[PDB]
Amino acid sequence: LSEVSVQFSQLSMFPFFDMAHYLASVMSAREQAGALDIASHSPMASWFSAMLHCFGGGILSSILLAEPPVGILANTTNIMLASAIWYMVYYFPYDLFYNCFFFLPIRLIAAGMKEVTRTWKILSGITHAHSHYKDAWLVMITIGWARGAGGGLISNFEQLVRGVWKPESNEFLKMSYPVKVTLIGAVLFTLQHGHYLPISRHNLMFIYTMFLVSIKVTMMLTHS
Amino acid sequence: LSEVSVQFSQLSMFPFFDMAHYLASVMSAREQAGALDIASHSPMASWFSAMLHCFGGGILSSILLAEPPVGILANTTNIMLASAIWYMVYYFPYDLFYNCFFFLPIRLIAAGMKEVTRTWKILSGITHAHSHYKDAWLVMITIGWARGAGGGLISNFEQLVRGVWKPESNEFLKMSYPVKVTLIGAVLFTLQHGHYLPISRHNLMFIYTMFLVSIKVTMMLTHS
Amino acid sequence: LSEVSVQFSQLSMFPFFDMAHYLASVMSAREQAGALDIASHSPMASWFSAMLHCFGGGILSSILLAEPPVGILANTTNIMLASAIWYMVYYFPYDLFYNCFFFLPIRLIAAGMKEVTRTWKILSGITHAHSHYKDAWLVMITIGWARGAGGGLISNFEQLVRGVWKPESNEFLKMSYPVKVTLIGAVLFTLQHGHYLPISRHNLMFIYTMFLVSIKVTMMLTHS
């Protein structure tokens, strides 16, 4: 029944899903060590650290392609869409916002939708790298990987923003779960582009997103 | 009497004022902790650290706009104009140069003129961001702020140049005086170009520069 | 006998010599402190650290000229030509690869040919900076120097890749031998393109390459 994958490919991420990636990234950034004290004594550094979690994919993909990183800041609709979630995750009265979204079902849905935004970011970078370099496989893998787990790769300098400098925790030394999955996804969809992978994009799109959501759901379920 | 602000808007900064910003930035870089030993044992690192104080506004504004940072190095007239001040601040015979400009009236004039160069840098980055992005308010604020206090934002990596690594002293954690004033100035003049602020450009230019020079003059006076 | 310098001005570096620079850079990167443990437990970090040694010249010259650093990754022939040397230097059976190239005559030839690749990289960056900026001397010096000893200037962040952070060992504080030689070469050949240096390009090319190979051969001979 390939008619269902065609319906899944018509999804738009501007309203609902972009907020889910921004919320899951800001909440996961708050749950990190010493992030509450940053927002309590320095809202500017905690906000910029949240933007590195939300738009880290577009920032790294722009720096690697010699594209202006301020161009991501031009979309005032998206920047304000993530800043409002940041202010509510940290500075909501009675912390009713975080306590509501920390609930297990709501946290599963929000995180699972961020996994969906990761897919289109990978394909965005792969097709965008194709616009700059035609059949260069390594460029498309790099930019698609840069948009999939951008915040995970700038995580070393993102830690430097909040104040913690950990030179021993490099992403290439121990590839974390999201970064290595984005690497696998970037390679697969580059072969999907490259036509070396015998499957349509939309079917590979659906099965990779499902294989990603199912794992993180299982992780968040087996963790609590 | 708005006829005086029109006369003030006609200042050219190429001869006198650019040297004032370069001198105030190089001298303030020397007075930092452990800067004399850098120039005495490694003139290369102290010179580059001085260039990050002088041209830090243009460097950060070029990196944010994907513009070549080496383009700032193209103006050999400006680079030599700051390197000559660097060599005289550190390596002048009998230190007659620094001892002359460390005098309170001369230090007040040189620093007060750097406050004037900060204004045109803010407006240069706001109008330059307007050339790249029409009515994007956040881009004009970012680039105008990047040229106002550029050396203050790269201060973390500028410290890494001389050899001091302070991951705890982030500019976003505690906003210093010059950086936060440039932020206020970048926001005000951005509302001016967007015509959201009910005042002419020339008058807002003059009152902001005066409000800036008067504060630093008061600071340098109340400090000695 | 200027008839021999013309025959030398004609070496093509695509087959033999590019592998020599990649081999000498990867082997010298392995001989660094704690580099074997990186490749044994984190092949991704050791590979990227090896690429920063091989293509650090092109990477830094691209970042300084606002050119896409991923553009160096487009040449899959050159990237695979260096990654194969990386895998054989580290993961060859019985380490027969490193033990063969660590032999003194073979190590002298491989390192001496990397010194030849350094020459064309300096001239590549000088002529490339001439294409972006006509008679800008400082830009031609910077880019030619950026291609000559690129891995030596990103060495601070390259150390951050493998996991070691030394904020005290800056290249400008104590200029190493290869970096300061590339600076001298970048200045000499910049005076050549500007015709301020009374010598033909081909002759200055040959005498500078010989003066560089003879020194490193003497160093490797007096070190063992």
What is the number of other CB atoms lying within 10 angstroms of the CB of residue B198?
8
DSSP H helices in chain B: 3-8, 16-30, 35-41, 43-54, 56-64, 76-91, 96-101, 104-132, 137-148, 150-153, 155-162, 177-193, 201-223
Residue of C nearest to A61 (CA): C70
**Distance from C-alpha of A157 to C-alpha of A164, rounded to nearest angstrom:** 9
**Distance from C-alpha of C125 to C-alpha of A114, rounded to nearest angstrom:** 43
Q: Which chains touch B (3 or more CB pairs under 8 A)?
A: A, C
Would you tell me the crossing angle of helices A177-193 and A201-223 to the nearest 10 degrees? 170
**Distance from C-alpha of C152 to C-alpha of C179, rounded to nearest angstrom:** 6
Residues in CB range of C5: below 8 A, 6 or more apart: C200, C202, C203, C205, C206
Alpha-carbon distance A9 to nearest alpha carbon in chain B (angstroms): 32
Inter-chain CB proximity B172 and A161 less than 8 Å: yes
User: Which residue type sits at B102?
Assistant: F
What does each C-alpha distance from C2 to C6, C10, C209, C212 come to in angstroms?
A: 7, 14, 15, 19
**Distance from C-alpha of B155 to C-alpha of B157, rounded to nearest angstrom:** 6
User: Which residue type sits at B144?
Assistant: G
Q: What is the dihedral of CA A84, A86, A92, A96, to 10 degrees?
A: 100
**Distance from C-alpha of C20 to C-alpha of C117, rounded to nearest angstrom:** 8
For A146, half-sphere exposure in the C-beta direction (CA atoms, 13 angstrom radius) is 21
Residue of A48, A68, A165 with shortest CB distance to B65: A68
A162 is in an annotated binding site: no
Q: Solved how?
A: X-ray
User: Which residue type sits at A172?
Assistant: F
**Distance from C-alpha of C159 to C-alpha of C168, rounded to nearest angstrom:** 12
Size of interface A-C (CB pairs under 8 A): 57
Residues in CB range of B10: below 8 A, 6 or more apart: none
Q: Residue A150's domain spans which residues?
A: 1-224
Q: Are B124 and B133 in contact (CB under 8 A)?
A: no
**Distance from C-alpha of B74 to C-alpha of A9, rounded to nearest angstrom:** 49
User: Which residue type sits at B7?
Assistant: Q
**Distance from C-alpha of B138 to C-alpha of A82, rounded to nearest angstrom:** 14
Q: Show contacts of B121-125: CB within 8 Å, 24+ apart.
A: B121/B57, B121/B58, B121/B147, B121/B148, B121/B150, B122/B147, B122/B148, B122/B182, B122/B185, B122/B186, B122/B189, B123/B189, B123/B201, B123/B205, B125/B57, B125/B61, B125/B186
Round the CA-based radius of gyration of chain C to a whole number and report it. 17
What does each C-alpha distance from B82 to B18, B51, B96, B215, C150 come to in angstroms?
A: 8, 7, 18, 25, 26
Round the CA-based radius of gyration of chain A to a whole number and report it. 17
**Distance from C-alpha of B8 to C-alpha of A32, rounded to nearest angstrom:** 51
- Closest residue by Cα to residue B135 from B144, B127, B145: B127
Which of B63, B170, B179 would best serve as a mutation to test chain A binding (most A beta carbons within 10 A)?
A: B170
Q: What is the dihedral of CA B58, B61, B66, B69, to 10 degrees?
A: 20
**Distance from C-alpha of B152 to C-alpha of B176, rounded to nearest angstrom:** 8
Q: Are A114 and A50 in contact (CB under 8 A)?
A: no
Q: Are A47 and A85 in contact (CB under 8 A)?
A: no
For B63, half-sphere exposure in the C-beta direction (CA atoms, 13 angstrom radius) is 15
> Which residues of B are annotated binding-site positions?
114, 118
Alpha-carbon distance C166 to nearest alpha carbon in chain B (angstroms): 9
The resolution, in Å, is 3.8
Alpha-carbon distance B146 to nearest alpha carbon in chain C (angstroms): 18
Domain count along chain B: 1
**Distance from C-alpha of C151 to C-alpha of C114, rounded to nearest angstrom:** 13
**Distance from C-alpha of C137 to C-alpha of B76, rounded to nearest angstrom:** 8
**Distance from C-alpha of A176 to C-alpha of A153, rounded to nearest angstrom:** 10
DSSP assignment string, B108-128: HHHHHHHHHHHHHHHHHHHHH
C114 is in an annotated binding site: yes
In the 3-class helix/strand/coil scheme, how is chain C assigned residue by residue?
Answer: CCHHHHHHCCCCCCCHHHHHHHHHHHHHHHCCCCHHHHHHHCHHHHHHHHHHHHCHHHHHHHHHCCCCHHHHHHCHHHHHHHHHHHHHHHHCHHHHHHHHHCCHHHHHHHHHHHHHHHHHHHHHHHHHHHHHCCCCHHHHHHHHHHHHCHHHHCHHHHHHHHCCCCCCCCCCCCCCHHHHHHHHHHHHHHHHHCCCCCCCHHHHHHHHHHHHHHHHHHHHHHHC
Q: Is A41 exposed, middle or buried (0-12, 13-18, 19+ CB in 10 A)?
A: exposed
Rounded to 5°, the CA angle B67-B68-B73 comes to 130
Inter-chain CB proximity A74 and B139 less than 8 Å: yes
What does each C-alpha distance from A106 to A23, A102, B76, B105, B124 come to in angstroms?
A: 11, 7, 59, 64, 47
Which residues of A fall below an 8 Å CB-CB distance to C? Answer: 64-66, 129, 132-133, 136-139, 142-143, 156, 165, 167-168, 170, 172-175
Inter-chain CB proximity A62 and B65 less than 8 Å: no
Which residues in chain C have their CB less than 8 angstroms from residue B160's CB?
156, 167, 170
Q: Are A207 and A185 in contact (CB under 8 A)?
A: no
Residues in CB range of C101: below 8 A, 6 or more apart: C23, C27, C89, C107, C110
Burial C43-74 (b: 16+ CB within 10 A, else e): ebbbbbbbbbbbbbbbbbbbbbbbbbbbbbbb
Q: Is A148 exposed, middle or buried (0-12, 13-18, 19+ CB in 10 A)?
A: buried
Inter-chain CB proximity C68 and A172 less than 8 Å: no
Inter-chain CB proximity B136 and A76 less than 8 Å: yes
What is the number of other CB atoms lying within 10 angstroms of the CB of residue C12?
9
